[PDB]
Amino acid sequence: TYNITGDGNSFTPTSDMTSTAAPAIDLKPGVLNPTGKLWRPVGTSVATID
Amino acid sequence: MAQRQFFGLTYNFYGQPAPLFDLNDLQELAGCYARPWTSRFSHLAISTGSLPVWSARYPSVASRNIVVNTLLGAHLNPFAGGQITSHQGITWRDPVLSSLAPVPAIQPPPVWAVAENVLLDSNNYPTYVLNLSSMWPINQDVHIMTMWALSDQGPIYHLEVPVDPMPAATTAALMAYTGVPIAHLAQTAYRFAGQLPQSPDSTMVSTIRWLSAIWFGSLTGRLNRSRTCNGFYFEFAKPALNPDQAVLKWNDGARAAPPAAAQSSYIRCISPHWQHQIVEVAGALMSQSVTAVTGLPALIDEATLPAWSQGVANLTGNGQGVVPCLDYNPVPMAAARHLQWRQDGLITAAQEAQLNNDYTAYALTIERHLTAMLVANPIAAGRMPIQPFNAADFGQAGQTAAAVALAQAMFV
Numbered sequence: 003t004y005n006i007t008g009d010g011n012s013f014t015p016t017s018d019m020t021s022t023a024a025p026a027i028d029l030k031p032g033v034l035n036p037t038g039k040l041w042r043p044v045g046t047s048v049a050t051i052d
Numbered sequence: 053m054a055q056r057q058f059f060g061l062t063y064n065f066y067g068q069p070a071p072l073f074d075l076n077d078l079q080e081l082a083g084c085y086a087r088p089w090t091s092r093f094s095h096l097a098i099s100t101g102s103l104p105v106w107s108a109r110y111p112s113v114a115s116r117n118i119v120v121n122t123l124l125g126a127h128l129n130p131f132a133g134g135q136i137t138s139h140q141g142i143t144w145r146d147p148v149l150s151s152l153a154p155v156p157a158i159q160p161p162p163v164w165a166v167a168e169n170v171l172l173d174s175n176n177y178p179t180y181v182l183n184l185s186s187m188w189p190i191n192q193d194v195h196i197m198t199m200w201a202l203s204d205q206g207p208i209y210h211l212e213v214p215v216d217p218m219p220a221a222t223t224a225a226l227m228a229y230t231g232v233p234i235a236h237l238a239q240t241a242y243r244f245a246g247q248l249p250q251s252p253d254s255t256m257v258s259t260i261r262w263l264s265a266i267w268f269g270s271l272t273g274r275l276n277r278s279r280t281c282n283g284f285y286f287e288f289a290k291p292a293l294n295p296d297q298a299v300l301k302w303n304d305g306a307r308a309a310p311p312a313a314a315q316s317s318y319i320r321c322i323s324p325h326w327q328h329q330i331v332e333v334a335g336a337l338m339s340q341s342v343t344a345v346t347g348l349p350a351l352i353d354e355a356t357l358p359a360w361s362q363g364v365a366n367l368t369g370n371g372q373g374v375v376p377c378l379d380y381n382p383v384p385m386a387a388a389r390h391l392q393w394r395q396d397g398l399i400t401a402a403q404e405a406q407l408n409n410d411y412t413a414y415a416l417t418i419e420r421h422l423t424a425m426l427v428a429n430p431i432a433a434g435r436m437p438i439q440p441f442n443a444a445d446f447g448q449a450g451q452t453a454a455a456v457a458l459a460q461a462m463f464v
Binding site for chain 1: 391395
């Protein structure tokens, strides 16, 4: 970090650079999913696929 | 060693007024033979599945197995009777039971004890217990009897894997026998065990028990070329028709995972096909020898047992060792074995698994039809030289897959 109380610092507000952060995010239920729960062939070897 | 209450169980009859044989058949037996000792029987059995097991009298090896038992069962009731009986055919060649004699002349007084379905305690008979030495070879024979007779199925075979202290001496010797089929090893074993009034010397004993496991383990799938008991497995020679002869084979792949300590099972075969499977039978004969030495957990609890063979002395119980018996149908197991093999990626199912399942399907069919057709005669005539059993008995069920899974977990 730099001493804030120095010279050279630009005050250039532009349309191009419109303030933004991440205020909130999408958390719709629908959106939560993707997708498949992970499972196993009973627990024995490759036979129990059923 | 002298397990005092050496009580042995004689076979029931299939809703028959008489024990399982007719007079002619018993005549055949007693007479055309002589000694009450298994030499003769083993002679037949030994001939490495070459000779057809069929005859006019004797449909299978197992047939003979059954009439051997019934023979025993009947003729013991004589001399093992409360005050000694013996006539009608058999009046024993000496009190010491030397030979199957046709009624000594001036000897009527010892009747033919008409018994029903009855266990006997060998040691409760004074003659029997006097002759404790000579008793020993026949007790072996006795067990064989009992352990088929207990049930209405294929034999109740016992298994044992004592894990960890494994004799180095056993290893060494056993290796020399590599190349031979289970059958001949068994034969020598029985012969020894009989020949010498039975020893506490666990040598023999251990050896048989290990062998039994290795076979069973092999037969299941658990044991094979790549998963061995140190090198040990049994190799199923000739992958075409169902005669896939289990030879002891020693190949170094892996040493399979040492179980926790002492693993015990007992198997029975629910399906009459057992009859033509010398493999299956030969384990059961092995486990008998074992018995003579050892006081096995009080026999397969009455839950899977016909009513006549419930509440037997000190044999069936409810809260002991091995409450349930492990049960199989032979043809489904072969499938089971191929399963494991494939699961391991030992082999492609592609051609290997398909082919042999094809052949064993054939072998089933052949067997099933022969056993049924033969049973027809006894199931119409007063004579019975064969296992009794309904067509529904052949069923692909009887806890077949559970057995397999248990056998496997045992190996862990």
